[model samples]
Every structure is written in C-alpha cells, then in structure tokens.
Target: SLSAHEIRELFLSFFEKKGHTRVKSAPLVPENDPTLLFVNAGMVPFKNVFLGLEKRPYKRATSCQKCLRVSGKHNDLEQVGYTSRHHTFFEMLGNFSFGDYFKKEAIEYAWEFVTEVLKLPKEKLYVSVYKDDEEAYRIWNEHIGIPSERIWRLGEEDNFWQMGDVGPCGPSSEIYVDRGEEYEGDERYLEIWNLVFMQYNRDENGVLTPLPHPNIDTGMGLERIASVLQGKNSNFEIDIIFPLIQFGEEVSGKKYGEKFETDVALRVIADHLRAITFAISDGVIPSNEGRGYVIRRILRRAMRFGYKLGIENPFLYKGVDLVVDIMKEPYPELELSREFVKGIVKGEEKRFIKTLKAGMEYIQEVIQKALEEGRKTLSGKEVFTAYDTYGFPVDLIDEIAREKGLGIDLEGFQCELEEQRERARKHPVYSHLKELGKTSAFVGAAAL
Candidate 1:
C-alpha cells in the first residue's frame, strides 16, 4: 500500500514523466489577485497564462498546490470535522495544459493514470460530463470503453466549471470512485478527479466567446486520494491526519473511536491545528479582521473543542510540533519558522481560553432566560452578540442550542450581523467611536 507521502510524490512524478513541467507549489497567499484572500485552486497561479495576459515557459505544467477553502465562494470550514472528506486546508495535485491538449487526450490521461498508474479498478470507476458535451461522452463511452450507463450526463451545475461570474468557463468531466453499496446513490460516489476544459470566455453580458486557444485544468485532492489508496474509510484515517488525531488523544486523555462525539472533537482539533499551523507558517496571523480574523476564528474553534474534551488550558500549541513534523517536508516553510508558528497558536489559545469560558457562561444565561420566558429558541441577536462581542463561533452556538433542545434564530442573527457590518461600512469612524465608548462604559461599570 502506498503511503500518503508516496502517493503525492507518485502523482507529481507521473505527470512529470508525461512531459509536464513540474512547477513548485505556489504560496497559500495569492499574489496580485485582490479578489481572493488565499490561493484556492491549482489553476490560480496560472490564471494569467490561461487568460493570455501573462506567459510561462512551459505549455504543460504540474503542481501540488497548497489551497485554503475557508472563506468566499469555496468556504468549507463548517463541514470539516463532520464530513469525512472536507478540510479548510488541503493540497490539490493538478496537471495543466496551456492550450496544448483538449478533451480526448485529457480524458485518456486521466483514465490511464487511475487505471494503469494507480491501479484502481476500472469497473468501480464512474464518470460524469456536461449534458451538452457529446465529445466528452464519446471519449468516455466509446473511446475509453466505459459503458454508457456508467457515464452520467449532468446539467451545468454539476458538469460546468467557471472561474468566476464572467471569465474562462466550460464543461467538465469528473471521475468518481464507487465506495460500494452504502454510498451507492449519493456523494458517497467519491469524486476524486476533475478535468475542466476551459474553451469559452464568458463576457459581462453572459455571452460566450471562443478563446483563441483552449486550456486544460485538472485537480485531484491529495488527502482524498491518499485515503482511497490506503483503503481508509475517512481522510482522517490516512497517514498524515491520524497522527494528529493520536496527538490530540494524548492531550485530551481520550481515545478516538471510543465515542462518536469524542471522535468528532478529536478530528476537529486535528484538522484545525493543521489549518492554523499552515496559515500562520505562511505569514498569516490571528487578528480581528479579514484573513487574520478567519485564522483566529479557526484557532478559537479548535480551542472550544478542546474545552469539550476536558482540556481547560492551552494544549493546541503542543500539537503544533506534530503538525510541523508531518507537513514540513512538503511545506518547508513550516519547519523554517516552527517556533514562530507555535508561539502564535499558543498566544491565541491562551487569550481565547478566558473569552471562551465567558462565552459558555453567556450562552447558559441566554438559555436560562429563554426558558424563564417560555421561549424555545434563542434569538439571533443574542447569538450574534456572543459571537461578535465574545469571539464565540456560531457553530458552537448552534451546537449548544441543539443540546439544550433549543433552536437558534440563525436568520435573525445573520440579519443583525449584516446590519452591523453595513453600519460599520457606512460610518467607519463613528463605529470605532461607539466601540470605544462601549469599552469605557463597561470598564466604569466594572470599577463601580
């Protein structure tokens, strides 16, 4: 069986052997793309070449790109520990063709890699393509010898790939590995690879124009494939992740797989540790706004999970070394600044511990008041206050609400949050003054 490290190396080597220029992974922070806070795709670094704005020396390129999907259009933070396959941070192994190859060869290469190189059984494989893409259908059904029944012709939502609202967009072909009877019908058909044909440029008017040269953008999730290769049921069971889980177990004095809830908490800590460690190593810090705030929220979230595991003090920072130990090889930056990353994580954890304790007490008070008032659900305004004021996360809020057999006015909370954001946007200076005033008032009251 191939280890996770071996599979990553094999993927890059396989593409390199196939005449693709092996490119180093781009930094997690996107360069020159103000629209995105972090690099979220393998094609991002090469977006210029695809758009004909810039050029690289090679027409064919391969990379194991570091990606984060915690915010914006690709946000997957909420699904991390609950799902088997999602992560805030992940690696995308891709082979790109800059106007060099089209659908047929792309399909052939994907098929050969999965069946011949990876040796995954062909019978268990399934493919999906755009509803109108007859060429893709022909390649998979007739040329590739996959039975027509095994190929699904999906609508644009599933089969089409778009870079943005108006830019390079086209039909895509996705490959799924059947995980057997249990996942037979749904997303249990683990889609491991996607081959996108960037042929048309969508203008602001929503009209499609043929590009002078087409491009190929393919992505396969490293952890997902590693899980498949190692015959593990979940990505957390893979080599890179399980060690983190074990470390989490040691810190919490709990065993994974012993209790379902415990397992989820352990997984959450492990996953979030990797995210915070990598993000901090890449020069992002825990702060109160934008990317930094997002990292802060993630770190605090893991700390809340640690609280659930009966760990009251700073413990996540201890797992920092293990994360650097496991990931430093591919991302040497982690090793280069290991102490700096650990210090940031530890400092955030320490600060959030007191705040989290208060947040917990605040939630209980809200629950008690709601019960006294014969209310079954907590108001979104209060929930948002706990989050915005105390740095409490909505997920923990929701979890607590559920545990108390109480519902949360999530929509109302979102409305309040948005209203606050709009107020801040309209009166930035006034908002700052209001916050300072509130702080002074609170301090004066506390002194009294």
Candidate 2:
C-alpha cells in the first residue's frame, strides 16, 4: 500500500504518463461567477474549458484541486462529525478528457489507477454505472474486468452529475471501496471516488447539445482513503488528523484513545480549526451573515468545546501548522501564509473567548437577581440580553442557569439573534473596513 506522499506522487506520475498535464490548483476565489459563489467542486475552474469560452490547454490535464463545500443545498458542515464521509474543505483529484477522448479510455484509466496502480484489493472494489449507460457499463465489465454483480446501476439522481442550470454534464460512474469485513456490512462506509463524464451541454433554453469536448472529472476524498489505508474506523482517527487529537490532549492534560468524551472534544476542535482557518484565509471574516456567520458560529463552537475540556487559554488557532504539514503538497500556502492564517485565527479566537467570558458574567448576574427576588427562574427576555448584545449561545446560559438552581426561557434567544442581525445591518460597511478604518474620509474615498 502507498503512503500518503506515495499516493499523491503515484497519481501525478501515472496521469503524467497518460498524456495528462498536471496543473496547479486554482486561486482561493473571491468574486462570484455565474455558476457558483465559491468553488465547491474541482470541475469549477475547468468549467470554462468544457465550454468554448476557453480552449483546452491540452487533450487532458489532471489536477489536485482545492474546494469548499460550505452552503447551498449541498452544505456538509452539519454532517461532519456525526457521519464518517462529510467534510467542508477537501481536495479533488481529477483528469479531464476534453473532447479528445471518450468512455473506453476514461473507464480503462480509472480502473488502472485504482486497482492495478493503487493496489486496492480487487474483491474489495465496486463500481456504479449509470442505468442504461450500456456503453460505459460494458467498458467497465468487459474491458476493466469488474464483476457484473458488483456494479450498481443507479438512476439519474444518483448516477448523473450536473452543474447548476446549464453546463457540461453526463452520467457519472463512481468507485467504491469495501473496508474488509468490518465495513462491508456497514452501509455508511461506501462510495468514495466519483468519475464524472462531461459530454452534454444543457443550454439556457433547457435544451441539450453534445459538447464538442467530452471530459472526465474524478474526485477521490483524500481523508477517506487515508482512513482506509491507516486501518482506522473513522477518518478523524487517521494520521492526517491525529495531531489535533494530540494538541487537545496536551492542552487539557487528558488521556485519549479510551475516553469517548475527550475524543469528541478533540475531534470537534481539530475539524473546526481547519474549517475556520480556510474560510478566513479565503477572506471570509467573522461577522453575522452568510459565510461570515458560518465562520463565527464555528469559532464560538470551538470556544465552547475548550471550556468543556477545561482549556482556559485560546489554543485552537495555534495548531495551524499540523494541518499545514499534512496538506503541504497540495496547499503549500497553508504553510507559506502560516503567519497570516494564524493571525486571522487568533483574532477570531480572542473575540469569541471575550464574548463567552462577558456572557457568563452577565448570566450569573441575572441568576443572582432572580434568586434575590425569590423567583426560581429568569425570563427568556432577561437571559437574552447577554446573547443579543454580547454574542452568547442560549445553551451557555441554560447550563449556568442549571448550576445556579435557576431555569431560563430559551425561546427568547431568537429575538436576540434577530436583534444582532439588525445592529450589523445598520453598521457602516465601507467606513469600518480594515484599510478604511485607519484612513481619513478623503484618503479612503480616493483609495478605491
């Protein structure tokens, strides 16, 4: 079996031999394009290549692509820890076939890379071909030697991959790895690599045309494969994420590998640190809306977990290099911009911890007032003042309320979040921006 570095090098070399030019990943995109607000898939940069807006640089090019799967219908943030196969940021290893090649070669190359080259055991592999895609199915079964029973024929929703509105798309065939007898019966542990054949162009008028170029877009989750290779049940248990666990353990002076609670706290911190760092690096600051809101929420969540693990200092952001070292080959910027990323994370962590401390103090005062008045509980309205103006979670108030022998009306927390949103809306945008905040009105006006 190949190590992580070996796996990456093997793929790049294999594709290079197959006449595919390896290219650098796209920039962390800022502005919105018609197809997406942020890049969610590897195929995003190559979308223009699939269409005729840009010419194909070569008949084939393979990339280790950087992507963010944040919002929209496919948001995977909530499913990250609860499930085994979800991630917000991941890499996609794709080789394009851009009108120069078709099904036979695409099918053959995918099998060759995974089975013969990667040496994943033949019996442990399964392929999913589009239903009625006889040409693709035959190539896999006859040409690739995949068993007929192992291939699952799925309908459009499952087998076909598409971009929003109109773009290059077609029936996709996916590769699945069976993790021995342990994961074979477990339904959650299947379907890893996806090979999307981009052949048809659906137009704005809802018409379909044959794309002059037929391309192959493949994505194999790096974390998932690492989990399987390292013989771990969860991707979080793999080496790529082990440093985070170590960091949490050392910071809390708690032993792991046995205690589930400690593991949970560690995993949450490790996973969220990566998510927060990358989102902020891409220019999403801590704020109360959209991606910014997502970043703020995760940062606060990390702080809450820190308190749970008895970590008094803000240590979450200091562990960025662990993430950088693991992904150095694909995202060297994680190391190159280490200071920049760490600075953003520290700013966010300090702000969140400050909010938590203030909120706790306010809630304690509220509980004291309720006790003095001979009341057993505080109204939702009073409890909300800490969160509304101070950025607290109702859970924090409720936890403290329980300890003080008091209860809280949490439905009022909604009013607090709404009020915060209103205040943020009224805040002057351009006047408070980083560069503008330091400049005179005239200088700021002329700057842009």
Candidate 3:
C-alpha cells in the first residue's frame, strides 16, 4: 500500500531530480494579499511574480502545498464527506515555471510523471482542453500521442483559469483516470492533474493581453491521487485519513460502513478535525467573525455530527492528536504547539456542546411553532437565531428540518447573516455591543 506520505516524497523527489527547486509549503493564512482570506492555491505565493510585482531567486519550483477550499474559489465545503472526491482541506502537489517552460514541456512533464513515476496506467488516462485552445490540443495529440478519442473539448467553466475579473488568465488542460465502466457517465472518470498554461494577463476591462512569456502552473490533488493508487473508493478510506475514522467509531461506539447517515457523520468529523487542527496551528481560532467564525462554524459542525453519533461530550479535541500525529512529519509547526492547539480544541468543544444542546431544544420549539402555524418552513430570523445566538450551524438546521418533513428559509438566514455583517461594518459601536452581548438595539431594529 502506497501511503500518502510516501507519495508526497516521491512527487517532490521526482521534480527535484528535474532541477526544480523544492520550496516549503506556505501558511494557510495568506500573509498580506487582501484579495484572499486564506491561501487557496499552490500558485498563490508566486502570484506577485506572475504579475511582475515581485521576484524570487528561482525560475522553477515544486511543492506539496497545503490548501483549503472552504470558501471562495475552488470551494468544496458543501460537498465534503458527501462525495468521494471533495474535502475542506487537501494538499496540492505542483510544479511551477516562471517563464522557464511552456506547453510542450508542461505536457511532457505531466505525462511522464503520472505514467512513469506514479505508474498510472496509460490506457485508462484521458485529457481535456479548452474549446479554443487548439495549440494545446495539438500538443497533447502530436507531442504526447494521446489519441483524439481519448481527449475531450470542454468549455471555460472546466478548462479556463482566471484569478478574478482581471489578472492572470489562461486556458488549462486536465487529466483524468478512468476508474472503470461503473463510474461511466459520472462514475468512472476521476480527474487527477490540471496543467495550466498561464499565457495572458486579463486587464481591469476584461481584455486579455499577451504576456512577455507564458508560465506553467500545474496542480494534482494529493488525496485524490492517493485514493486512486490505494484502490480506495472514498478519500476517507485512505491510510492518512482512515485512522481518524477508526477513532471516530471507537469514541462513538458505532461502526463505520454500517449505516449511511452514521458513516457520513463519522467522515465529517474526520475531515473537520484535520482542518480545524491545521487552521489553529496556523494561528487561527474559533470566533464570531471572519476566519475565526469559519473555524467556529466548522467546530460546531463537527460537534453536531458528534451529537448524532451519541457523543455528548468533548470528543473532537481528542482527535486533534491524531491529526498532529499523521501530519506533523511534513508540517513540523503542528508539533510546535500541538498541546496548545489541543487545548483550544478542548475549550471550544466544551463551550459548543452546551450551545448545541440548548440550541437543539430551541430549534425543536421553533419547528413546533412553524408547524402549529401550518408553515412548511422556519422563518429566516428563527433559523438565524439558532445560528447566531445559540451557535447551531445552518446545515444541521437543514438536516433536522428535513427529518421533520419541513424546511428552512435558507435565503432568509443568509440575509440575516449579511445584515449582521453590514451592521458590524457600518457601526463600530454596534459591533462593540455585539461583543458585549448587548446588541438588543440592533436586534430590535432588525425585527421590524
């Protein structure tokens, strides 16, 4: 069994042998780029270089970048645990070229690495390119000798890469591995690597102008590829992550692969524990706004699943050690404050478990009232109250509502959440009052 750790070393060594400088992973929190709340991609640290704003000593680099996709670009939070291929946190193994390589070399490197180094079967491999990128089409067909039938012409949504409305725009070619006929139509093909040709710069007016030189930024998901190699159906079953699932089963006195709902909850706990532990180790904490708020929501979310598993106490904090244990070798910063991160997890878990119990009672009350009123959905304010004051996550509300054969005004809840953020921005004193738990003035005004 090829473990994830072995594969990461294999990838870096393969690129290093090609004379690519192996750079360390960047922090999960972006250093100074205000455009992003967190570092979401492997190429982020080099974005300034891509735009000619900054410079690095090397022209070629490789890294196993730790990335999060909870929000913004590449978001997979909503699909985590429910799908075989999605995760809130994953690693991106990439080889980058700052004007040192172009399409021909990029295509060649990806092909050789996947087929020769990783030994993914050549026959099961497939490729896709942007509809307008015929040069790339020819390179794959002529240079690589991949048959035309094995290649797909996809649209911008799948084949195009743009940082935002303007800046660093280009077409990308993706590689997929066929799992088998059962995965056909949506089941068989698993996309593993994306070769991005950063060929142009998009201006503020949405026009793309040719850059002095084209850059290559390629990414292959570590977990997805690991799953493919390990012959696991879901990423959760992989060696690096499966132990966490085992711990979840041990703590909850429930067996995984036994019940679908229980299995999902267990997977959610396994995934969120790694995310929260790493985010905290990177200096984030649970709070009521911004990154902290995201961490808080993730914690409550995992705890909600814990509740479903019949775990009524602080169990999530214990899982932190497993994450640190599994990941500490590559990310030694995790070992630096392992105990401190566990302390925070323990404290947050204790606080949110109380909130979850109290909120569940209130949530039931809200559900009953809506039913008495012959309503099919709980109002936005009612849902928001469970989320805002009592710390219940929106997804848990949705799950519970569905089980009751009812619904929630999710749009209304989002509106309420946005209004709160707006108030926090417009009135600093109101934000202060919120911190003091005396925001009745804003709350009363909002009800009207």
TM-score winner, 1 or 3: 3
Residue 65 in model 1: shift from native, Å?
1.0
What is the C-alpha lDDT profile of model 2 across 1-448, one tens digit per residue? 4455666667777998999999877754536573454577767787777675788658788877667775567676555544555666666677877777778887788888887787778887888889988988898889888899888898999888777677667889988887766445544336667888876778887787877657777787777776666777777767667677787888888866777666766777777777776666667776654455556666776777677788877887777766777767666667667777788778877766876766666777888989999978877567556545566544445555876799875444434434544665797223333332122111211221
lDDT of each: 0.83, 0.70, 0.83
Query: Candidates ranked by lDDT, best first?
Result: 1, 3, 2
Question: Which candidate tops TM-score?
Answer: 3
lDDT (Cα, tens digit) per residue for candidate 1, span 1-448: 7887887888889988889999998888876776787888999899888888898889999999989998778998877788778888899999999989889989998999999888899998999999999999998999999998789999989999888899999999999999888655545688999999998989999999987889999999999988888988889999999999998898889998998889888888989988898888887987655577678778877888888899888999899999999987777777887999889888887767998888888888999889889999989688767766776656567777776788888567656655766776698112243253223211211111
Q: Write the per-residue lDDT of candidate 3 for residues 242-356, one digit (tens) a residue.
A: 9999989999999999988889888899999998998999889876555776677678778888888999889998999999999988888898879999999999987768878
**TM accuracy, model 2:** 0.80
Give candidate 2's error at residue 436 in angstroms.
Answer: 27
Clashes of each: 0, 2, 3
Question: Against the hidden true structure, what lDDT does model 3 obtain?
Answer: 0.83
